[PDB]
Amino acid sequence: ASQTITVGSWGGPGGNGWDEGSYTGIRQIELSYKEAIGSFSVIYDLNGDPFSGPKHTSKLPYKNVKIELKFPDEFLESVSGYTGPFSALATPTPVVRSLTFKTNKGRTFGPYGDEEGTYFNLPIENGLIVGFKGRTGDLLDAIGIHMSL
Amino acid sequence: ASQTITVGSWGGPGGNGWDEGSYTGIRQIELSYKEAIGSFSVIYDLNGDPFSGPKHTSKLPYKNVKIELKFPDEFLESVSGYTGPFSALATPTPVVRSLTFKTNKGRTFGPYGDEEGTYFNLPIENGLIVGFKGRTGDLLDAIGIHMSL
Amino acid sequence: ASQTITVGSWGGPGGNGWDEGSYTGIRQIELSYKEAIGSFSVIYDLNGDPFSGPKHTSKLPYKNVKIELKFPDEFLESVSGYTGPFSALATPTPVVRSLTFKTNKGRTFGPYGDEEGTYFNLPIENGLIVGFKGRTGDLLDAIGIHMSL
Amino acid sequence: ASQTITVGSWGGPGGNGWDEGSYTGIRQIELSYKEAIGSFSVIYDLNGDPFSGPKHTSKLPYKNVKIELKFPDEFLESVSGYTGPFSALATPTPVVRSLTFKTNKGRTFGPYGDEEGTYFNLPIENGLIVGFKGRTGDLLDAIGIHMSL
């Protein structure tokens, strides 16, 4: 059972948890958004071959978007976003409202979802986001990260 | 030259940089504070023997404080705080204003320094803060972290 | 691109190289043998689900064998074997003649293949064999290992 | 308590154990030898400054030798040697009789001590020997290694 530095879990305890696990790297990210982040599934790299992980999609009719990294020369060097409860979707607990990624090549994938609530930002100076972990219900209640060299 | 996952660097580009490096674990943290964090030096564990790292002290007449962890049964599981520019000490760039630690034993070392500015929080679910990195001038301009299993 | 401590490469430069990569752990090992080791393919654990890696089989009509580890309570704690050139199969370079595994549960999978040539033994005191690397032609010319915590 | 992949422990159970721990790298190695290896102490690199670890010296009047690596451009890429019991020094258990190092720059520090007994060889394809572990009595009964990226 090898283990991987797991960091954070930003967001609330709502929805059901999920942990896609560790892989060799990240190739593509797919997420839906509107006033908050809804669906979130990612395509990892498993030793050279692309491996699509579990789909954590939500029913909310949100705008979808694909984030294609120019792997393996380009990789996430920063993950930041906003977390706060959502009124329209009657649930008392916090939800990831906004998410925004930044790659080592200078490419930043603009903030998806409203930018309001308490801020969180993970600047990676040395290391690789090798996998995602998080909780999903009708939206993305929380999101976590696996890292390695 | 062996390397360690390095994360963050929360705060501004002011002052001079410093990186204390990687060690086996953390035993004691010493920092001075008032409206922001000033001095910051830590005592690591180098294979069982306590090893005091470089002192990054500031002249500002601030209130000092020692944080003694009950090593190795107790270790930091969360580091959070605030970063924002400081008026009184004329400098245009952001500074770590507040810092607050939480150990796996439930012990939280209350927020030191004013809690205003943009928030940052590093929840550690699996891994160890094995070393600090950061920038100091008259205060603690920024602070970073080294992690490992 | 998430790298993993890679060790050894015991054996000769004959045949074609191959690297199955890193995974979460090892579940089953399949190898054929006679006077030396011929086919060698393994089934890894990818975050809980069994993942069969590339088949590196050889044509030689050798006796096959499956090594099923009681994962995840049981794992390899030692890999040792013999390397030396082979007469019968006219090739001037060394080949892994014998291979023998030992698990943390005391189970040792007896030496497969003749035990002659120069000896090699990797005792693992702390760490996990998380993936194999090696060269195959008509037999297993050499074998390597990926490790992680 | 951060941990490091620890490998091997080649040699016998004689003498008293010792573990110098993990450091940033290796700068110099000092060992004494004759028909077997006697004294063995090393100077590590602790984040840039040379750090001398525990001296594991033996009284046997052996020939001493210093191995200075051109750190950090040069580092051990292979450690091999011989282990077998020693007659002259009446002890029934195995002892490391010979030890030989090879650096990434092509420099090989010739076999020290008689080359007889069972062979052991650790080729490092990716990773760093970051610390030694071993057992010493009147000679070097066994030797182990800590590795990391």
Ligand SMILES: CO[C@H]1O[C@H](CO)[C@@H](O)[C@H](O)[C@@H]1O
């Ligand atoms: C209102 O319903 C769903 O979505 C919210 C936020 O995603 C969760 O907290 C909740 O448990 C349900 O899964």
Ligand SMILES: CO[C@H]1O[C@H](CO)[C@@H](O)[C@H](O)[C@@H]1O
């Ligand atoms: C005003 O002087 C000092 O302290 C501030 C904040 O610590 C730094 O930005 C600056 O460069 C100096 O080191």
Ligand SMILES: CO[C@H]1O[C@H](CO)[C@@H](O)[C@H](O)[C@@H]1O
């Ligand atoms: C004789 O043929 C094959 O097998 C040997 C040993 O496996 C290799 O060295 C060689 O290149 C071929 O692949």
Ligand SMILES: CO[C@H]1O[C@H](CO)[C@@H](O)[C@H](O)[C@@H]1O
């Ligand atoms: C004969 O005396 C010493 O040295 C040998 C080999 O080093 C050890 O096995 C033994 O316990 C003593 O420490």
